[PDB]
Amino acid sequence: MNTPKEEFQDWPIVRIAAHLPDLIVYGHFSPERPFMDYFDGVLMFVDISGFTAMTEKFSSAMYMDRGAEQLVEILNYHISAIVEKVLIFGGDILKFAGDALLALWRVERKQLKNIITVVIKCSLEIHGLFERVKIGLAAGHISMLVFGDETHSHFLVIGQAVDDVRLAQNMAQMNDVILSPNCWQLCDRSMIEIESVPDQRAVKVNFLKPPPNFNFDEFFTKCTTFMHYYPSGEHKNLLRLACTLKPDPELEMSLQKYVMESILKQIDNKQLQGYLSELRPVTIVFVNLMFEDQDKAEEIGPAIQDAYMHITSVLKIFQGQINKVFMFDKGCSFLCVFGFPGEKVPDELTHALECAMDIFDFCSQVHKIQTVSIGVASGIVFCGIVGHTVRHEYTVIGQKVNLAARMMMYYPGIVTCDSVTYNGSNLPAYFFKELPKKVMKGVADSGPLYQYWGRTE
Amino acid sequence: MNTPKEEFQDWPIVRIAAHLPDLIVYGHFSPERPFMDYFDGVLMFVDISGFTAMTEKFSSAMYMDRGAEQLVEILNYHISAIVEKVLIFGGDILKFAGDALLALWRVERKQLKNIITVVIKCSLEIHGLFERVKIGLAAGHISMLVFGDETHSHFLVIGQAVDDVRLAQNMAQMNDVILSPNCWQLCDRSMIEIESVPDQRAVKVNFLKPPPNFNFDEFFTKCTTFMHYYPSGEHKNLLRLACTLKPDPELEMSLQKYVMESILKQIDNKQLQGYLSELRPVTIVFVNLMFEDQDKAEEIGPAIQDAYMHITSVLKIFQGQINKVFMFDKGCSFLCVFGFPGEKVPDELTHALECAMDIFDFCSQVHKIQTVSIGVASGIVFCGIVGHTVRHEYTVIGQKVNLAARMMMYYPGIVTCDSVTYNGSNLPAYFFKELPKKVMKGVADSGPLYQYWGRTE
Amino acid sequence: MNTPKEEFQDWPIVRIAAHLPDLIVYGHFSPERPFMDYFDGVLMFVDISGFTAMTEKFSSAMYMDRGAEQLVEILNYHISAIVEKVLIFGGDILKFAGDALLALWRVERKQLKNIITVVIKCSLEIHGLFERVKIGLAAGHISMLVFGDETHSHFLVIGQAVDDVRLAQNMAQMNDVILSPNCWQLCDRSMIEIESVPDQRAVKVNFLKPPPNFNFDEFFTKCTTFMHYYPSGEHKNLLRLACTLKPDPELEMSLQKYVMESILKQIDNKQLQGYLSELRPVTIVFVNLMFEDQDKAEEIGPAIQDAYMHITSVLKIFQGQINKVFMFDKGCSFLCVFGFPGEKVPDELTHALECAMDIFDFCSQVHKIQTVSIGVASGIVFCGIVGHTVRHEYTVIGQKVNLAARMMMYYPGIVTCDSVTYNGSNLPAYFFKELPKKVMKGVADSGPLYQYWGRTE
């Protein structure tokens, strides 16, 4: 009697799970919104903007109309190698963004010290791949927020360690590994030689020099005792346990709400697998919400949910999409896009600005939101699924993405827009104010910027 | 000199063969129609209506427009496991229908007794997968009928054992294995403890308790001597020998005639592989032909061919399709569908009824057809390819499928239609008669039913 | 710590490389056009017209509109086996054409003798696959020419050995292996029994009978010392080293210029993988350029580049495409196609003829082109990607392809067209001259042929 080998793990639920971290896939938490949970862990923030500032070159006529395809190919080739390292070292990749990848090792407080050693070794091996990234590491308390409505879900991690991992990454230069102050306080200092960072309490890792009898392979195996989903046994040849998920309609109903409908259409083999890799004109509406206090989801969770409920209703009118949400220094940011593939509407510029002002006016009145700021920028951006086969996400990359992001931070409390949006809106000129030009990070020659003042005085 | 490993078995002819049993793939019989052949074997009828009555839940708004995709995913996950068991135990899966799967072990008469033991063990292992199916087993003489024209082919198995396997399956409750009276007469009673079935000559298998020195693995190997196509040797890791078919234009020309053109288009990579999984509105025209004598293909074969020739010409006018043909208790049934994906026409309801009446009038005059009955029902049905990667078939599932099927049996000798068809036809009301409402199996609240009386008195 | 196995080699750059020989993939030569290089090697010309004269049968109504699909399936099944033999024996497949496959073993002059032995054994093993091809072998100096513009590239091999391999193949009968005179002069005569060819200096291989202590496996291994890209070590299970190419935007930019945009669209998963396999009506414009001297790229290279520059500008107006370029007996031939899938225009016939006359008039004035001849033929041709998964090319096959090719050779110095083109052009009849009918190889009943004389006297 024969024993044919199994082949089939390529179910829709597995394809959906590629777009999500284990934090969500195996979370099995309540469907109430907002949902908040609390834990401890180590965060790794890998800055990949050496690789993503290349989107300019790929718009060149040299690439003969295959710019988007070449860009996603070379990006995924390099990001895939980073992903594999994170996953084999036991990390859960939470999110991809144009300029970064955030990973989490969730553990009980008593194992933080040893897990930081694992994460530092992982970091050093990532830098070894490119002998061009910057790595910030943090550790400590982490809060998770899940918000959404009956058809869509989003999640965020928040807290001091999340803020810390961003600050640490910003301090880093090429090939640096920077530990947040609490990570350095928590780590095993017998193992790692550091140096101080000027004017900073964070530290830079110079060396991982373990004691004479230390065996990293045996140490790592001991650490896998605390990793709930590390592929093992019969499945030790897989990068993710999620690769083994089996059909389960209740679970798939839950997980699909995190993924854009156009991606679900490709997952269902109802759209060509390359339709979503494109250089295309879009309008970015980057919404920033600032609170009094950054690291307490119990106060900001309800506010973000209330904002989200209004944002989704405004965007739906114009097939706008929330591509990503981020949280830093008591600012929660929504990266909204008008014009994604198959979602284009006429008067995109006008409607982007009217939607921004609607969001601005509503969210300004939401309890506990202190300031709303919105940047609106329009131009050619790269869109596509970025990452590894087993862990990837739809992402947008481009100068206009970075411009809208810097505008909402450098011009707080107002709706701003770039010259493309201003000139191509069908709105009267006195609806706008020409702004002073500010030197903004990563922005060279943004063009004239405007405040959308709106229809009345 | 290198020895690269072979990879390629994914030819069109192999993809086509997934949709067909070995009875056809390796049949190499005449192209004359009708064709009849005669043999002996064991039939297994696995009732999967615990799984297919779920189509209701998947039309719920809870599934956010991915009902069809979730349904085919979970169905195929469970049906695939049944298929693998049947195939490793040496069976040939003849047909899939919404509510069942029919498999055949064809053998010489002298090996029936031992093959029934194999099939009973297979049955018990299928029930073990779900520790929700019902299994009927029959054995004896089996006739095969192949009918069609120059471009399309269909096949049927007929005879007392085919009738027996249906009756046995109907007697079964969840987790039962029921042996037809001839199967019990033919089987190895030293091996299996049975109990009587009230008012029935069939029996229920309680236990497979073989003698002290019995080794099932060695017994099965001896039984593979009589299985012409059991994967073996270099190919012992395959579920089907058909996986190894090599291009052969004359054979592919023959096999493609059994498969719908929309499926061939997907096989040829000219249509997206998920286009055919849909919840869509269709009209089912379920045609039943009753003969004087059920189990003699020599008399009914020519009649079915003559009917088919007319049915295909009527359907072609409106891109109707024969999805399945079945044979029971001297009734041959055609499951016809108007509105399959890419085959929709306007006035579908009117044309369904006019086509039914045309079929009715013609087939009523075919020699040896005693009664024609046609049920017409319209609504949302699931359509998609159901089964295992190596053995699957396009199938339709839904309350309206079951309703049309019950209508042709409970209202024999006439054309009947449901309320959706009546209300949405463009035909005058006096073309119809409102019928008494009958309690019908599996039908709850069918709605008012009508006879299509037709244009004149 | 787990060690998952690598899976991913299916990058766009790898898919592109399937369409190209190693001569180009690993060439890393200048982007100047024309580019010429010079080397030595052994050529094998495998004539597959036993297999490709079948396109007639597959247009029959017997194939029920799946003629193209069945044809490409059976062709690729047989051609794939030839390709695998060539590749394992160390050859580089340069080109596929309807009626042939050309392969190259490039080596230093001192290793020619031993490589010819390898190539003869390869040839005999190819004939063993079909126990229906004809094989010609040549050896000696080979020139390579690369021509094109900033977006498209084409290459050719030229010289006496290239002419020789064609002549040798023409002399061959079914199952023959014919050695060109220089190949016989260069080979190891202790190894191979030959017989003379009537009126020819070429020879036919009767037998490969090596000396008593000869071990072909050990001999082949010694010969792999001179094969730069023979898959080895960790990659000894691959047919091509190109299967391991990694993303490299500068290299992909270079390689894509050799591949049609419709193929690139399929490679990018933006078109269905079977869209390009079709039986469709096209117009073939077969352009032949004859020079004074055939085997010196230094003189003919600049002329072909100048012609190409004009040809591409004329074709672009009507989405005509260069499908293949060939070089024989100081004739360089361009196989141009109007009407490829997704490239159809109205008045295709008129524009084909006007484009031919434009090309004729320009190329007739190019320095060192002695004669231009153009054949124009219109009808149903097979189009599709022909070859092995790892080495394949888009190809056109059909009686009208062969007719246009014979017309440009049998009617030199003029533009000729077939009856379909003449009757369906919108041009006046006195623009044409009815020609004497010539008996042409492989052409039976071409129909009346015409010279396109053009608008004035």
PDB file of N, CA, C and O in Angstrom, chain B residues 1-5 8 11-13 16 150-151 246-250 252-253 256-257 264 267-272, chain C residues 57-58 62-64 66 69-70 73-74 76-77 88-89 216-217 220 230-231 236-239 272-275 277:
ATOM      1  N   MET B   1      29.181  13.437 -16.379  1.00  0.00           N
ATOM      2  CA  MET B   1      27.911  13.818 -17.131  1.00  0.00           C
ATOM      3  C   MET B   1      26.726  13.832 -16.192  1.00  0.00           C
ATOM      4  O   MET B   1      26.428  12.826 -15.542  1.00  0.00           O
ATOM      5  N   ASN B   2      26.033  14.956 -16.106  1.00  0.00           N
ATOM      6  CA  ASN B   2      25.023  15.071 -15.078  1.00  0.00           C
ATOM      7  C   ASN B   2      23.777  14.272 -15.414  1.00  0.00           C
ATOM      8  O   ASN B   2      23.500  13.942 -16.569  1.00  0.00           O
ATOM      9  N   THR B   3      22.995  14.023 -14.371  1.00  0.00           N
ATOM     10  CA  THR B   3      21.743  13.270 -14.427  1.00  0.00           C
ATOM     11  C   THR B   3      20.661  14.083 -13.739  1.00  0.00           C
ATOM     12  O   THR B   3      20.196  13.734 -12.653  1.00  0.00           O
ATOM     13  N   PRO B   4      20.231  15.172 -14.351  1.00  0.00           N
ATOM     14  CA  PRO B   4      19.206  16.005 -13.717  1.00  0.00           C
ATOM     15  C   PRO B   4      17.942  15.199 -13.464  1.00  0.00           C
ATOM     16  O   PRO B   4      17.618  14.280 -14.207  1.00  0.00           O
ATOM     17  N   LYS B   5      17.245  15.538 -12.390  1.00  0.00           N
ATOM     18  CA  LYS B   5      16.016  14.825 -12.071  1.00  0.00           C
ATOM     19  C   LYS B   5      14.868  15.342 -12.925  1.00  0.00           C
ATOM     20  O   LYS B   5      14.819  16.513 -13.303  1.00  0.00           O
ATOM     21  N   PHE B   8       8.820  17.239 -15.089  1.00  0.00           N
ATOM     22  CA  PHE B   8       7.639  17.714 -15.809  1.00  0.00           C
ATOM     23  C   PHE B   8       6.659  16.589 -16.093  1.00  0.00           C
ATOM     24  O   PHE B   8       6.905  15.710 -16.938  1.00  0.00           O
ATOM     25  N   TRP B  11       1.626  18.445 -18.273  1.00  0.00           N
ATOM     26  CA  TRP B  11       1.081  18.611 -19.607  1.00  0.00           C
ATOM     27  C   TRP B  11      -0.444  18.766 -19.584  1.00  0.00           C
ATOM     28  O   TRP B  11      -1.122  18.195 -18.707  1.00  0.00           O
ATOM     29  N   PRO B  12      -1.008  19.427 -20.617  1.00  0.00           N
ATOM     30  CA  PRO B  12      -2.444  19.455 -20.776  1.00  0.00           C
ATOM     31  C   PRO B  12      -3.091  18.091 -20.680  1.00  0.00           C
ATOM     32  O   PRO B  12      -4.149  17.986 -20.058  1.00  0.00           O
ATOM     33  N   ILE B  13      -2.522  17.049 -21.300  1.00  0.00           N
ATOM     34  CA  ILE B  13      -3.206  15.757 -21.241  1.00  0.00           C
ATOM     35  C   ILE B  13      -3.313  15.244 -19.792  1.00  0.00           C
ATOM     36  O   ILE B  13      -4.289  14.578 -19.422  1.00  0.00           O
ATOM     37  N   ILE B  16      -6.109  17.259 -18.110  1.00  0.00           N
ATOM     38  CA  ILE B  16      -7.399  16.741 -18.545  1.00  0.00           C
ATOM     39  C   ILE B  16      -7.728  15.449 -17.818  1.00  0.00           C
ATOM     40  O   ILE B  16      -8.857  15.235 -17.381  1.00  0.00           O
ATOM     41  N   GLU B 150     -19.797  13.932 -31.958  1.00  0.00           N
ATOM     42  CA  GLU B 150     -18.426  14.007 -32.430  1.00  0.00           C
ATOM     43  C   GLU B 150     -17.561  14.913 -31.575  1.00  0.00           C
ATOM     44  O   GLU B 150     -16.339  14.865 -31.704  1.00  0.00           O
ATOM     45  N   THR B 151     -18.148  15.760 -30.737  1.00  0.00           N
ATOM     46  CA  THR B 151     -17.346  16.682 -29.948  1.00  0.00           C
ATOM     47  C   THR B 151     -17.458  16.505 -28.442  1.00  0.00           C
ATOM     48  O   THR B 151     -16.577  16.993 -27.731  1.00  0.00           O
ATOM     49  N   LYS B 246       1.746  10.806 -21.023  1.00  0.00           N
ATOM     50  CA  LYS B 246       2.571  11.666 -21.845  1.00  0.00           C
ATOM     51  C   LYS B 246       1.765  12.146 -23.024  1.00  0.00           C
ATOM     52  O   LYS B 246       0.767  11.506 -23.400  1.00  0.00           O
ATOM     53  N   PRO B 247       2.127  13.302 -23.583  1.00  0.00           N
ATOM     54  CA  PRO B 247       1.402  13.799 -24.765  1.00  0.00           C
ATOM     55  C   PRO B 247       1.162  12.709 -25.760  1.00  0.00           C
ATOM     56  O   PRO B 247       2.030  11.873 -26.053  1.00  0.00           O
ATOM     57  N   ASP B 248      -0.023  12.748 -26.315  1.00  0.00           N
ATOM     58  CA  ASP B 248      -0.541  11.781 -27.281  1.00  0.00           C
ATOM     59  C   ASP B 248      -1.767  12.456 -27.905  1.00  0.00           C
ATOM     60  O   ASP B 248      -2.842  12.420 -27.293  1.00  0.00           O
ATOM     61  N   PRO B 249      -1.641  13.100 -29.077  1.00  0.00           N
ATOM     62  CA  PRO B 249      -2.771  13.893 -29.591  1.00  0.00           C
ATOM     63  C   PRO B 249      -4.046  13.075 -29.804  1.00  0.00           C
ATOM     64  O   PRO B 249      -5.127  13.586 -29.590  1.00  0.00           O
ATOM     65  N   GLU B 250      -3.949  11.830 -30.295  1.00  0.00           N
ATOM     66  CA  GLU B 250      -5.164  11.048 -30.515  1.00  0.00           C
ATOM     67  C   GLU B 250      -5.871  10.773 -29.190  1.00  0.00           C
ATOM     68  O   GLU B 250      -7.099  10.883 -29.082  1.00  0.00           O
ATOM     69  N   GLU B 252      -5.571  12.621 -26.332  1.00  0.00           N
ATOM     70  CA  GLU B 252      -6.109  13.874 -25.807  1.00  0.00           C
ATOM     71  C   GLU B 252      -7.370  14.301 -26.547  1.00  0.00           C
ATOM     72  O   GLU B 252      -8.298  14.861 -25.942  1.00  0.00           O
ATOM     73  N   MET B 253      -7.412  14.115 -27.870  1.00  0.00           N
ATOM     74  CA  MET B 253      -8.633  14.433 -28.607  1.00  0.00           C
ATOM     75  C   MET B 253      -9.834  13.682 -28.041  1.00  0.00           C
ATOM     76  O   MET B 253     -10.931  14.250 -27.898  1.00  0.00           O
ATOM     77  N   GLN B 256     -10.578  14.982 -24.142  1.00  0.00           N
ATOM     78  CA  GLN B 256     -11.092  16.337 -23.937  1.00  0.00           C
ATOM     79  C   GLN B 256     -12.597  16.402 -24.144  1.00  0.00           C
ATOM     80  O   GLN B 256     -13.252  17.301 -23.601  1.00  0.00           O
ATOM     81  N   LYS B 257     -13.180  15.462 -24.908  1.00  0.00           N
ATOM     82  CA  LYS B 257     -14.589  15.548 -25.203  1.00  0.00           C
ATOM     83  C   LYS B 257     -15.458  15.365 -23.966  1.00  0.00           C
ATOM     84  O   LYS B 257     -16.658  15.669 -24.006  1.00  0.00           O
ATOM     85  N   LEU B 264     -11.348  23.369 -20.116  1.00  0.00           N
ATOM     86  CA  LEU B 264     -10.234  23.257 -21.058  1.00  0.00           C
ATOM     87  C   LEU B 264      -9.512  24.600 -21.207  1.00  0.00           C
ATOM     88  O   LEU B 264      -8.281  24.634 -21.268  1.00  0.00           O
ATOM     89  N   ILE B 267      -7.281  24.894 -18.298  1.00  0.00           N
ATOM     90  CA  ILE B 267      -6.192  23.920 -18.469  1.00  0.00           C
ATOM     91  C   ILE B 267      -5.145  24.423 -19.445  1.00  0.00           C
ATOM     92  O   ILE B 267      -3.928  24.155 -19.276  1.00  0.00           O
ATOM     93  N   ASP B 268      -5.561  25.158 -20.441  1.00  0.00           N
ATOM     94  CA  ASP B 268      -4.673  25.739 -21.434  1.00  0.00           C
ATOM     95  C   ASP B 268      -4.067  27.081 -20.989  1.00  0.00           C
ATOM     96  O   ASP B 268      -3.406  27.789 -21.784  1.00  0.00           O
ATOM     97  N   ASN B 269      -4.285  27.451 -19.733  1.00  0.00           N
ATOM     98  CA  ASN B 269      -3.733  28.692 -19.200  1.00  0.00           C
ATOM     99  C   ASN B 269      -4.185  29.894 -20.006  1.00  0.00           C
ATOM    100  O   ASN B 269      -3.454  30.870 -20.160  1.00  0.00           O
ATOM    101  N   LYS B 270      -5.449  29.871 -20.451  1.00  0.00           N
ATOM    102  CA  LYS B 270      -6.066  30.994 -21.143  1.00  0.00           C
ATOM    103  C   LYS B 270      -7.187  31.618 -20.327  1.00  0.00           C
ATOM    104  O   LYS B 270      -7.851  32.530 -20.787  1.00  0.00           O
ATOM    105  N   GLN B 271      -7.360  31.179 -19.092  1.00  0.00           N
ATOM    106  CA  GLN B 271      -8.341  31.711 -18.163  1.00  0.00           C
ATOM    107  C   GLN B 271      -7.753  31.552 -16.768  1.00  0.00           C
ATOM    108  O   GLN B 271      -7.087  30.561 -16.491  1.00  0.00           O
ATOM    109  N   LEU B 272      -8.029  32.497 -15.896  1.00  0.00           N
ATOM    110  CA  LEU B 272      -7.506  32.446 -14.522  1.00  0.00           C
ATOM    111  C   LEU B 272      -8.042  31.239 -13.760  1.00  0.00           C
ATOM    112  O   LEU B 272      -9.214  30.897 -13.866  1.00  0.00           O
TER     113      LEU B 272
ATOM    114  N   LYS C  57      -2.117  19.084 -39.993  1.00  0.00           N
ATOM    115  CA  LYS C  57      -3.071  18.221 -39.322  1.00  0.00           C
ATOM    116  C   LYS C  57      -3.753  18.969 -38.178  1.00  0.00           C
ATOM    117  O   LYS C  57      -4.958  18.830 -37.979  1.00  0.00           O
ATOM    118  N   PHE C  58      -3.018  19.834 -37.471  1.00  0.00           N
ATOM    119  CA  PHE C  58      -3.563  20.462 -36.270  1.00  0.00           C
ATOM    120  C   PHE C  58      -4.474  21.618 -36.587  1.00  0.00           C
ATOM    121  O   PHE C  58      -5.169  22.113 -35.702  1.00  0.00           O
ATOM    122  N   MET C  62     -10.793  18.250 -36.661  1.00  0.00           N
ATOM    123  CA  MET C  62     -10.679  17.182 -35.662  1.00  0.00           C
ATOM    124  C   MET C  62     -10.185  17.698 -34.311  1.00  0.00           C
ATOM    125  O   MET C  62     -10.490  17.096 -33.275  1.00  0.00           O
ATOM    126  N   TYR C  63      -9.364  18.732 -34.292  1.00  0.00           N
ATOM    127  CA  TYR C  63      -8.775  19.200 -33.039  1.00  0.00           C
ATOM    128  C   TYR C  63      -9.671  20.194 -32.286  1.00  0.00           C
ATOM    129  O   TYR C  63      -9.264  20.684 -31.219  1.00  0.00           O
ATOM    130  N   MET C  64     -10.878  20.447 -32.789  1.00  0.00           N
ATOM    131  CA  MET C  64     -11.929  21.142 -32.031  1.00  0.00           C
ATOM    132  C   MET C  64     -11.414  22.445 -31.417  1.00  0.00           C
ATOM    133  O   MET C  64     -11.516  22.669 -30.209  1.00  0.00           O
ATOM    134  N   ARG C  66      -8.624  23.312 -30.383  1.00  0.00           N
ATOM    135  CA  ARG C  66      -7.429  23.225 -29.544  1.00  0.00           C
ATOM    136  C   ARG C  66      -6.209  22.769 -30.352  1.00  0.00           C
ATOM    137  O   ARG C  66      -5.258  22.259 -29.792  1.00  0.00           O
ATOM    138  N   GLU C  69      -2.894  24.350 -29.059  1.00  0.00           N
ATOM    139  CA  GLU C  69      -2.477  23.815 -27.773  1.00  0.00           C
ATOM    140  C   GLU C  69      -1.930  22.402 -27.883  1.00  0.00           C
ATOM    141  O   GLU C  69      -0.925  22.065 -27.231  1.00  0.00           O
ATOM    142  N   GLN C  70      -2.585  21.572 -28.694  1.00  0.00           N
ATOM    143  CA  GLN C  70      -2.095  20.217 -28.885  1.00  0.00           C
ATOM    144  C   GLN C  70      -0.767  20.232 -29.611  1.00  0.00           C
ATOM    145  O   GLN C  70       0.142  19.443 -29.293  1.00  0.00           O
ATOM    146  N   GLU C  73       2.064  21.336 -27.296  1.00  0.00           N
ATOM    147  CA  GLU C  73       2.278  20.254 -26.339  1.00  0.00           C
ATOM    148  C   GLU C  73       3.111  19.113 -26.948  1.00  0.00           C
ATOM    149  O   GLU C  73       4.095  18.663 -26.353  1.00  0.00           O
ATOM    150  N   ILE C  74       2.708  18.592 -28.111  1.00  0.00           N
ATOM    151  CA  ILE C  74       3.451  17.448 -28.618  1.00  0.00           C
ATOM    152  C   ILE C  74       4.830  17.894 -29.123  1.00  0.00           C
ATOM    153  O   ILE C  74       5.827  17.190 -28.923  1.00  0.00           O
ATOM    154  N   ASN C  76       6.714  20.425 -27.965  1.00  0.00           N
ATOM    155  CA  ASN C  76       7.608  20.617 -26.843  1.00  0.00           C
ATOM    156  C   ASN C  76       7.963  19.340 -26.137  1.00  0.00           C
ATOM    157  O   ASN C  76       9.027  19.281 -25.486  1.00  0.00           O
ATOM    158  N   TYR C  77       7.084  18.349 -26.160  1.00  0.00           N
ATOM    159  CA  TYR C  77       7.411  17.061 -25.552  1.00  0.00           C
ATOM    160  C   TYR C  77       8.628  16.428 -26.240  1.00  0.00           C
ATOM    161  O   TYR C  77       9.572  15.959 -25.581  1.00  0.00           O
ATOM    162  N   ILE C  88      22.944  18.283 -21.331  1.00  0.00           N
ATOM    163  CA  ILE C  88      23.762  17.425 -20.481  1.00  0.00           C
ATOM    164  C   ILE C  88      25.096  17.118 -21.127  1.00  0.00           C
ATOM    165  O   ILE C  88      26.076  16.884 -20.430  1.00  0.00           O
ATOM    166  N   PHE C  89      25.152  17.067 -22.455  1.00  0.00           N
ATOM    167  CA  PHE C  89      26.407  16.871 -23.175  1.00  0.00           C
ATOM    168  C   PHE C  89      27.202  18.177 -23.308  1.00  0.00           C
ATOM    169  O   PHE C  89      28.235  18.201 -23.999  1.00  0.00           O
ATOM    170  N   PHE C 216      33.730   6.469 -21.944  1.00  0.00           N
ATOM    171  CA  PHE C 216      33.197   7.752 -22.370  1.00  0.00           C
ATOM    172  C   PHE C 216      32.940   8.679 -21.185  1.00  0.00           C
ATOM    173  O   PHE C 216      33.129   9.903 -21.292  1.00  0.00           O
ATOM    174  N   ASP C 217      32.482   8.126 -20.060  1.00  0.00           N
ATOM    175  CA  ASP C 217      32.191   8.944 -18.880  1.00  0.00           C
ATOM    176  C   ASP C 217      33.436   9.670 -18.392  1.00  0.00           C
ATOM    177  O   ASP C 217      33.377  10.858 -18.036  1.00  0.00           O
ATOM    178  N   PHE C 220      34.327  12.304 -21.064  1.00  0.00           N
ATOM    179  CA  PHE C 220      33.463  13.465 -20.968  1.00  0.00           C
ATOM    180  C   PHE C 220      33.878  14.339 -19.787  1.00  0.00           C
ATOM    181  O   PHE C 220      33.966  15.574 -19.901  1.00  0.00           O
ATOM    182  N   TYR C 230      29.340  24.402 -17.313  1.00  0.00           N
ATOM    183  CA  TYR C 230      28.721  23.132 -17.086  1.00  0.00           C
ATOM    184  C   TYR C 230      28.261  23.010 -15.641  1.00  0.00           C
ATOM    185  O   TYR C 230      29.080  23.225 -14.728  1.00  0.00           O
ATOM    186  N   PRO C 231      26.973  22.744 -15.372  1.00  0.00           N
ATOM    187  CA  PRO C 231      26.500  22.727 -13.980  1.00  0.00           C
ATOM    188  C   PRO C 231      27.263  21.685 -13.180  1.00  0.00           C
ATOM    189  O   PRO C 231      27.397  20.536 -13.590  1.00  0.00           O
ATOM    190  N   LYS C 236      25.081  20.352  -9.690  1.00  0.00           N
ATOM    191  CA  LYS C 236      25.180  19.321 -10.715  1.00  0.00           C
ATOM    192  C   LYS C 236      23.821  18.731 -11.089  1.00  0.00           C
ATOM    193  O   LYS C 236      23.730  17.944 -12.048  1.00  0.00           O
ATOM    194  N   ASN C 237      22.763  19.079 -10.368  1.00  0.00           N
ATOM    195  CA  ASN C 237      21.447  18.537 -10.729  1.00  0.00           C
ATOM    196  C   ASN C 237      20.647  19.465 -11.635  1.00  0.00           C
ATOM    197  O   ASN C 237      19.493  19.150 -11.963  1.00  0.00           O
ATOM    198  N   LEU C 238      21.225  20.593 -12.061  1.00  0.00           N
ATOM    199  CA  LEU C 238      20.549  21.550 -12.930  1.00  0.00           C
ATOM    200  C   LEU C 238      20.963  21.347 -14.377  1.00  0.00           C
ATOM    201  O   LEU C 238      22.091  20.939 -14.662  1.00  0.00           O
ATOM    202  N   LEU C 239      20.056  21.681 -15.301  1.00  0.00           N
ATOM    203  CA  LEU C 239      20.382  21.592 -16.718  1.00  0.00           C
ATOM    204  C   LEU C 239      21.168  22.795 -17.202  1.00  0.00           C
ATOM    205  O   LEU C 239      21.874  22.698 -18.210  1.00  0.00           O
ATOM    206  N   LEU C 272      -1.722  35.970 -19.248  1.00  0.00           N
ATOM    207  CA  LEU C 272      -1.883  34.525 -19.018  1.00  0.00           C
ATOM    208  C   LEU C 272      -0.848  33.713 -19.788  1.00  0.00           C
ATOM    209  O   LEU C 272      -0.544  34.009 -20.938  1.00  0.00           O
ATOM    210  N   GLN C 273      -0.326  32.667 -19.148  1.00  0.00           N
ATOM    211  CA  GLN C 273       0.847  31.958 -19.619  1.00  0.00           C
ATOM    212  C   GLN C 273       0.564  31.209 -20.905  1.00  0.00           C
ATOM    213  O   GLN C 273       1.538  30.806 -21.548  1.00  0.00           O
ATOM    214  N   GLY C 274      -0.710  31.050 -21.312  1.00  0.00           N
ATOM    215  CA  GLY C 274      -1.076  30.438 -22.573  1.00  0.00           C
ATOM    216  C   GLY C 274      -1.602  31.351 -23.654  1.00  0.00           C
ATOM    217  O   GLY C 274      -1.961  30.861 -24.730  1.00  0.00           O
ATOM    218  N   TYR C 275      -1.591  32.677 -23.449  1.00  0.00           N
ATOM    219  CA  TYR C 275      -2.079  33.640 -24.423  1.00  0.00           C
ATOM    220  C   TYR C 275      -1.305  33.569 -25.737  1.00  0.00           C
ATOM    221  O   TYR C 275      -1.823  33.944 -26.775  1.00  0.00           O
ATOM    222  N   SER C 277       0.177  30.929 -27.292  1.00  0.00           N
ATOM    223  CA  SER C 277       0.076  29.715 -28.104  1.00  0.00           C
ATOM    224  C   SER C 277      -1.196  29.827 -28.943  1.00  0.00           C
ATOM    225  O   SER C 277      -2.301  29.716 -28.421  1.00  0.00           O
TER     226      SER C 277
END
